[PDB]
Amino acid sequence: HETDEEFDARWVTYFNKPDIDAWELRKGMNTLVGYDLVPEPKIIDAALRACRRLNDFASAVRILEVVKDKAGPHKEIYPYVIQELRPTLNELGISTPEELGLDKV
């Protein structure tokens, strides 16, 4: 079908819709995590900013958790994605699951 870039672009466009609603945010993330991939930082970036326009801090944190979960045993992926998101995390005031202690069992 579509290239990797066409896929990422569709998903960036989806979350960037200015008046995206909460149902669409959930439908988007719950659909995305069914694919065999960890979403590119640019996708996650768009989804966090959707959380911001929806005034939903908690879902922003959950999205970071599911990025880590989708990586499975590839422990290098999540710190890379956080690294790439740090400007957005700082701009939006999103704390990571780790900074909130939510990575404790």
Partner: protein, 144 residues
């Protein structure tokens, strides 16, 4: 917090790592302070304290990913109990041998077996691989 049976037709909360954003919030009713916190959530999140961010997370969700995904000691119980009941089974077999089974036939007496073995060797039972093949007819012993 309290899920009721008469709610089964309504959208419900679940913690599943493959359904990260459930259909409802974990906590729907809000106290005065929790209302104020949701109002503050409309302003910059950088002004929320860590405790306020955690509280917002726990209003939305019940367990974190780390919590819902935790490993448990259950296997110890399962494997140990199964071995217990398998051991119990051996008690039934001891009982059966003691109270139900009588003597086995005289053909398992050591001398009978020794004679039956030689006669099987004399008729060359399974002489290519199975039985007599393993006997050294020249040295008159089992092949090493």
């Amino acid at each position: 917090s309290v899920v009721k049976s008469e709610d089964y037709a309504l959208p419900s909360y679940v913690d599943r790592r493959d359904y990260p954003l459930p259909d409802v919030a974990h906590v729907k009713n809000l106290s005065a302070s929790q209302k104020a916190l949701k109002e503050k959530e409309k302003a910059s999140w950088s002004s929320l304290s860590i405790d306020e961010k955690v509280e917002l997370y726990r209003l939305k969700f019940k367990e974190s990913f780390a919590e819902m995904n935790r490993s448990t000691n259950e296997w110890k119980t399962v494997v140990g109990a199964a071995m217990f009941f398998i051991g119990f089974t051996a008690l039934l077999l001891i009982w059966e041998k003691h109270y139900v089974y009588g003597p086995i036939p005289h053909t398992f007496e050591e001398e009978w077996v020794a004679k039956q073995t030689k006669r099987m060797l004399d008729m060359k039972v399974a002489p290519i691989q199975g039985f007599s093949a393993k006997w050294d007819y020249d040295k008159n012993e089992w092949k090493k």
